[PDB]
Design an enzyme around this catalytic site. Structure first.
Site, PDB file in Angstrom:
ATOM      1  CG  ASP A   1      36.412 -27.182  -2.695  1.00 14.46           C
ATOM      2  OD1 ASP A   1      35.519 -28.025  -2.977  1.00 14.46           O
ATOM      3  OD2 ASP A   1      36.402 -26.524  -1.657  1.00 14.46           O
TER       4      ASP A   1
ATOM      5  NE  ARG B   1      31.907 -26.762  -1.638  1.00 15.92           N
ATOM      6  CZ  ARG B   1      31.815 -28.031  -2.010  1.00 15.92           C
ATOM      7  NH1 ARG B   1      30.628 -28.586  -2.213  1.00 15.92           N
ATOM      8  NH2 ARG B   1      32.910 -28.763  -2.167  1.00 15.92           N
ATOM      9  CG  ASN B   2      34.056 -23.548  -4.437  1.00 16.85           C
ATOM     10  OD1 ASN B   2      33.726 -22.597  -3.695  1.00 16.85           O
ATOM     11  ND2 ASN B   2      34.596 -24.646  -3.962  1.00 16.85           N
TER      12      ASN B   2
ATOM     13  CB  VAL C   1      34.262 -10.019   5.430  1.00 15.68           C
ATOM     14  CG1 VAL C   1      33.490  -8.888   4.739  1.00 15.68           C
ATOM     15  CG2 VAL C   1      33.665 -10.307   6.820  1.00 15.68           C
ATOM     16  CB  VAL C   2      33.691 -11.685  -0.179  1.00 12.06           C
ATOM     17  CG1 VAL C   2      33.932 -11.207  -1.604  1.00 12.06           C
ATOM     18  CG2 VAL C   2      34.593 -12.891   0.139  1.00 12.06           C
TER      19      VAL C   2
ATOM     20  CD  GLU D   1      34.965 -12.188 -14.492  1.00 11.99           C
ATOM     21  OE1 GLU D   1      34.049 -12.178 -15.338  1.00 11.99           O
ATOM     22  OE2 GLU D   1      36.000 -12.883 -14.623  1.00 11.99           O
ATOM     23  CE1 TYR D   2      29.121  -8.960  -6.977  1.00 13.66           C
ATOM     24  CE2 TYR D   2      28.184  -8.043  -8.980  1.00 13.66           C
ATOM     25  CZ  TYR D   2      28.029  -8.522  -7.691  1.00 13.66           C
ATOM     26  OH  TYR D   2      26.809  -8.591  -7.088  1.00 13.66           O
ATOM     27  CG  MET D   3      31.390 -14.091 -11.166  1.00 17.25           C
ATOM     28  SD  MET D   3      31.451 -13.924 -12.975  1.00 17.25           S
ATOM     29  CE  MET D   3      30.454 -15.220 -13.417  1.00 17.25           C
TER      30      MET D   3
ATOM     31  CG  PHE E   1      40.421 -17.312   2.308  1.00 19.08           C
ATOM     32  CD1 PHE E   1      40.363 -17.484   0.931  1.00 19.08           C
ATOM     33  CD2 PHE E   1      41.241 -18.162   3.046  1.00 19.08           C
ATOM     34  CE1 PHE E   1      41.067 -18.528   0.303  1.00 19.08           C
ATOM     35  CE2 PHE E   1      41.937 -19.215   2.418  1.00 19.08           C
ATOM     36  CZ  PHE E   1      41.844 -19.393   1.051  1.00 19.08           C
TER      37      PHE E   1
ATOM     38  CG  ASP F   1      37.076 -18.603  -4.846  1.00 20.62           C
ATOM     39  OD1 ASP F   1      37.806 -17.627  -4.721  1.00 20.62           O
ATOM     40  OD2 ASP F   1      35.846 -18.520  -4.824  1.00 20.62           O
TER      41      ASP F   1
ATOM     42  CB  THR G   1      31.439 -15.002   5.084  1.00 18.33           C
ATOM     43  OG1 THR G   1      30.418 -15.986   5.286  1.00 18.33           O
ATOM     44  CG2 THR G   1      31.157 -13.754   5.929  1.00 18.33           C
TER      45      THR G   1
HETATM   46  C1  LIG Z   1      33.582 -16.096  -4.711  1.00 19.66           C
HETATM   47  C2  LIG Z   1      32.949 -15.473  -3.487  1.00 19.66           C
HETATM   48  C3  LIG Z   1      33.084 -16.080  -2.221  1.00 19.66           C
HETATM   49  N1  LIG Z   1      33.923 -17.211  -2.085  1.00 19.66           N
HETATM   50  C4  LIG Z   1      35.138 -17.195  -1.487  1.00 19.66           C
HETATM   51  O1  LIG Z   1      35.641 -16.181  -1.019  1.00 19.66           O
HETATM   52  C5  LIG Z   1      35.853 -18.507  -1.408  1.00 19.66           C
HETATM   53  C6  LIG Z   1      35.244 -19.693  -1.813  1.00 19.66           C
HETATM   54  C7  LIG Z   1      35.910 -20.902  -1.707  1.00 19.66           C
HETATM   55  C8  LIG Z   1      37.209 -20.969  -1.196  1.00 19.66           C
HETATM   56  C9  LIG Z   1      37.918 -22.327  -1.064  1.00 19.66           C
HETATM   57  C10 LIG Z   1      38.079 -22.985  -2.449  1.00 19.66           C
HETATM   58  C11 LIG Z   1      39.315 -22.188  -0.430  1.00 19.66           C
HETATM   59  C12 LIG Z   1      37.088 -23.268  -0.182  1.00 19.66           C
HETATM   60  C13 LIG Z   1      37.824 -19.775  -0.811  1.00 19.66           C
HETATM   61  C14 LIG Z   1      37.154 -18.565  -0.902  1.00 19.66           C
HETATM   62  C15 LIG Z   1      32.459 -15.554  -1.085  1.00 19.66           C
HETATM   63  C16 LIG Z   1      31.715 -14.391  -1.189  1.00 19.66           C
HETATM   64  C17 LIG Z   1      31.580 -13.759  -2.412  1.00 19.66           C
HETATM   65  C18 LIG Z   1      32.166 -14.290  -3.567  1.00 19.66           C
HETATM   66  C19 LIG Z   1      31.843 -13.653  -4.877  1.00 19.66           C
HETATM   67  N2  LIG Z   1      32.841 -13.369  -5.739  1.00 19.66           N
HETATM   68  C20 LIG Z   1      32.511 -12.788  -6.902  1.00 19.66           C
HETATM   69  N3  LIG Z   1      31.303 -12.397  -7.321  1.00 19.66           N
HETATM   70  C21 LIG Z   1      30.324 -12.682  -6.437  1.00 19.66           C
HETATM   71  N4  LIG Z   1      28.988 -12.393  -6.560  1.00 19.66           N
HETATM   72  C22 LIG Z   1      28.324 -12.822  -5.416  1.00 19.66           C
HETATM   73  C23 LIG Z   1      26.886 -12.580  -5.206  1.00 19.66           C
HETATM   74  C24 LIG Z   1      26.241 -13.114  -4.087  1.00 19.66           C
HETATM   75  C25 LIG Z   1      24.878 -12.948  -3.911  1.00 19.66           C
HETATM   76  C26 LIG Z   1      24.123 -12.234  -4.843  1.00 19.66           C
HETATM   77  C27 LIG Z   1      22.665 -12.023  -4.575  1.00 19.66           C
HETATM   78  O2  LIG Z   1      22.324 -11.649  -3.468  1.00 19.66           O
HETATM   79  N5  LIG Z   1      21.768 -12.237  -5.564  1.00 19.66           N
HETATM   80  C28 LIG Z   1      20.353 -11.890  -5.331  1.00 19.66           C
HETATM   81  C29 LIG Z   1      19.754 -11.240  -6.566  1.00 19.66           C
HETATM   82  N6  LIG Z   1      19.899 -12.109  -7.730  1.00 19.66           N
HETATM   83  C30 LIG Z   1      19.244 -11.518  -8.902  1.00 19.66           C
HETATM   84  C31 LIG Z   1      21.319 -12.337  -7.989  1.00 19.66           C
HETATM   85  C32 LIG Z   1      21.987 -13.015  -6.796  1.00 19.66           C
HETATM   86  C33 LIG Z   1      24.773 -11.680  -5.950  1.00 19.66           C
HETATM   87  C34 LIG Z   1      26.137 -11.845  -6.124  1.00 19.66           C
HETATM   88  C35 LIG Z   1      29.227 -13.411  -4.574  1.00 19.66           C
HETATM   89  C36 LIG Z   1      30.507 -13.328  -5.199  1.00 19.66           C
END
Ligand SMILES: Cc1c(NC(=O)c2ccc(C(C)(C)C)cc2)cccc1-c1ncnc2[nH]c(-c3ccc(C(=O)N4CCN(C)CC4)cc3)cc12
Length: 262
Positions: free
Chosen positions: A127, A131-132, A21-22, A81-83, A19, A145, A16
């Protein structure tokens, strides 16, 4: 900018954010995507949709790309994009080894390239913090973000005295006057460099917010981490000048980082 939701395959939960759930999925049965499922009432959706084209046109290899939106169902979706390796903060904390200083500087260089690009478009992140930032499968850091802070509906996040406000990444003019500029992202970048070199420690860990503000006002700053050379520390320290105009630009910081990299 409207993505056909039928082109999306939801595959896994990705935790999460501000905003809600992702999820992880596939776009056109081939491309990895992160799909933000916008919790109703958490975001200024109309404002984001009317301004999103600017953000979709922000394209740089070190920015986590916004691919499009799906706004005809509840909740709306933001497709990015997925990271593969998740957020930088967890990456720094979970790695078992003491990072080579060259690799830490490379993370700083990646963020600085993305920020130099946003600065060239007069687009504030608002921000910037570890963490971002996200990490791909090759250890490349990308800035995520950017600008989404503007659409948050949550006083705990938007108020400088709120529990979620990025106080420890904010310059004095943001905290006292709500004065944001290219120079408030510069300050945040210096703190991010400190987070990288401290291997993910919380900035000013021993201080409350008011003690942090008094520490700053007396000219004290975050200390030089064990892994940061005097040259690297001079770079992050330059981001924290009391006067916003005396802080460097991202173009200058990038030039400084590249000199240290040799
Ligand atoms: C960006 C983003 C947000 N953030 C937001 O929505 C958001 C943030 C800030 C804001 C404000 C600025 C307004 C405060 C708004 C929204 C929230 C959830 C998911 C993601 C997200 N987006 C893209 N790619 C991702 N990958 C992961 C990812 C997570 C865990 C792993 C994992 O378990 N492992 C274990 C194994 N090890 C080898 C690799 C890592 C892998 C990939 C998350 C990603």
């Amino acid at each position: 900018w409207e993505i056909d939701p039928k082109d999306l395959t939801f595959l896994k939960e990705l935790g999460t954010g501000q905003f809600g759930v992702v999820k992880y999925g596939k776009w056109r049965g081939q491309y990895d995507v992160a799909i933000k499922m916008i919790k109703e009432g958490s975001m200024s959706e109309d404002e984001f949709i009317e301004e999103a084209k600017v953000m979709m046109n922000l394209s740089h290899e070190k920015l986590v790309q916004l691919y499009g939106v799906c706004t005809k169902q509840r909740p709306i979706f933001i497709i990015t994009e997925y990271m593969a390796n998740g957020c930088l903060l967890n990456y720094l904390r979970e790695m078992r080894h003491r990072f080579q200083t060259q690799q830490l500087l490379e993370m700083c260089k990646d963020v600085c390239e993305a920020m130099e690009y946003l600065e060239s478009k007069q687009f504030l992140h608002r921000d910037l913090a570890a963490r971002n930032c996200l990490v791909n499968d090759q250890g490349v850091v990308k800035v995520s973000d950017f600008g989404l802070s503007r659409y948050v509906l949550d006083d705990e996040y938007t108020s400088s005295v709120g529990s979620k406000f990025p106080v420890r990444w904010s310059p004095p003019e943001v905290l006292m006057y709500s004065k944001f500029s290219s120079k408030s992202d510069i300050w945040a970048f210096g703190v991010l460099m400190w987070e990288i070199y401290s291997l993910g420690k919380m900035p000013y860990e021993r201080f409350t917010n008011s003690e942090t503000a008094e520490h700053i006002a007396q000219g004290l700053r975050l200390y030089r981490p064990h892994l940061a050379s005097e040259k690297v520390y001079t770079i992050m320290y330059s981001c924290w000048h009391e006067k916003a105009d005396e802080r460097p630009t991202f173009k200058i910081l990038l030039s400084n980082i590249l000199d240290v990299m040799d």
